Design a protein around this ligand. Structure first.
Ligand SMILES: NC(=O)c1ccc[n+]([C@@H]2O[C@H](COP(=O)([O-])OP(=O)(O)OC[C@H]3O[C@@H](n4cnc5c(N)ncnc54)[C@H](OP(=O)(O)O)[C@@H]3O)[C@@H](O)[C@H]2O)c1
Ligand SMILES: CCC[C@H]1c2ccccc2C=NN1C(=O)/C=C/c1cc(Cc2cnc(N)nc2N)cc(OC)c1OC
Length: 161
C-alpha cells in the first residue's frame, strides 16, 4: 500500500519555518501507531527538521544530494524509487512530496487540525468528491492536547460507468 500521512489545518497549512506550527502530542502518537513496523518516505527538509531517524520503522529520504548518508536512513534520488519499496509505504512530507504524490497514493491518513495557524508550507487542495471517508474520529482533548483535531482515513474513489 502507498499512503499519505499528514496533519493540516483548516487552511491546509502543514508547516512553518521547517517545524510543525502546532504542539499536539496526540498526533505524533497517532503517527507512531500507524507507521511503526512500516516505511516512511520524506523529503530532505522534513528529515532535517526531525533531526534523526524515527525508531522501529524504515526511514527513507528523498534528496538530490548524492553525498547524503545518515546511519539508520535509506536514501532515494527519484520519485520512481518509491514504487520499489516493499510493504506499507507512508508519504511523510513535506509540501513537495505531497504535491508529487497526492495523485498517486491509494489512500490518505489525514489529521485535520481544527484551527488557523501561520504557515509557509501547505498540503495541496483536494475534494471529498474524489475521496471516501473510510473513517473520521475526533481526537480527545486534555491538558497536553488542547487543539481540536480529527483523524481522517480517506480512500480514493473509483470513477465508474
Ligand atoms: N503537518 C504534517 O503532517 C507535515 C508532514 C512532514 C513535514 N511537514 C513540514 O513540511 C515543511 C517542509 O516541506 P518542504 O516542501 O519545504 O520540504 P520537503 O518536502 O520536506 O523536502 C524538500 C526536499 O526533498 C527533495 N525532493 C523532493 N522531491 C524530489 C525529487 N523528485 N527528486 C529528488 N529530490 C526531491 C529535495 O531535497 P534536496 O534539496 O536535498 O535535493 C528538496 O529540496 C516543513 O515546514 C515541515 O515542518 C509537516
Ligand atoms: C509519540 C511518539 C512521538 C514520535 C515517535 C517516537 C518513537 C518512535 C516513533 C515515533 C513517531 N513519530 N514521533 C515524532 O516525534 C514525529 C515528529 C514529526 C512528524 C512529522 C510528520 C508528520 C506529523 N504529523 C502527521 N499527522 N503526519 C506526519 N507525516 C513532521 C515533523 O516535523 C516537521 C515531526 O517533528 C515534530
Amino acid at each position: 500500500t502507498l499512503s499519505i500521512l499528514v496533519a493540516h489545518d483548516l487552511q491546509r497549512v502543514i508547516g512553518f519555518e521547517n517545524q510543525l506550527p502546532w504542539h499536539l502530542p496526540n498526533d505524533l502518537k497517532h503517527v507512531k501507531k500507524l507507521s511503526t513496523g512500516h516505511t516512511l518516505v520524506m523529503g530532505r527538509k522534513t528529515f532535517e527538521s526531525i533531526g534523526k531517524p524515527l525508531p522501529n520503522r524504515r526511514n527513507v529520504v528523498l534528496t538530490s544530494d548524492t553525498s547524503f548518508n545518515v546511519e539508520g536512513v535509506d536514501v532515494i534520488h527519484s520519485i520512481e524509487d518509491i514504487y520499489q519499496l516493499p510493504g506499507h509505504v507512508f508519504i511523510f512530507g513535506g509540501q513537495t512530496l505531497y504535491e508529487e504524490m497526492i495523485d498517486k497514493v491509494d489512500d490518505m491518513y489525514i489529521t485535520v487540525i481544527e484551527g488557523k495557524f501561520r504557515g509557509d508550507t501547505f498540503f495541496p487542495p483536494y475534494t471529498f468528491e474524489d475521496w471516501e471517508v473510510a473513517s473520521s474520529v475526533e481526537g480527545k482533548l486534555d491538558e497536553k492536547n488542547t487543539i481540536p483535531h480529527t483523524f481522517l482515513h480517506l480512500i480514493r474513489k473509483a470513477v465508474p460507468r
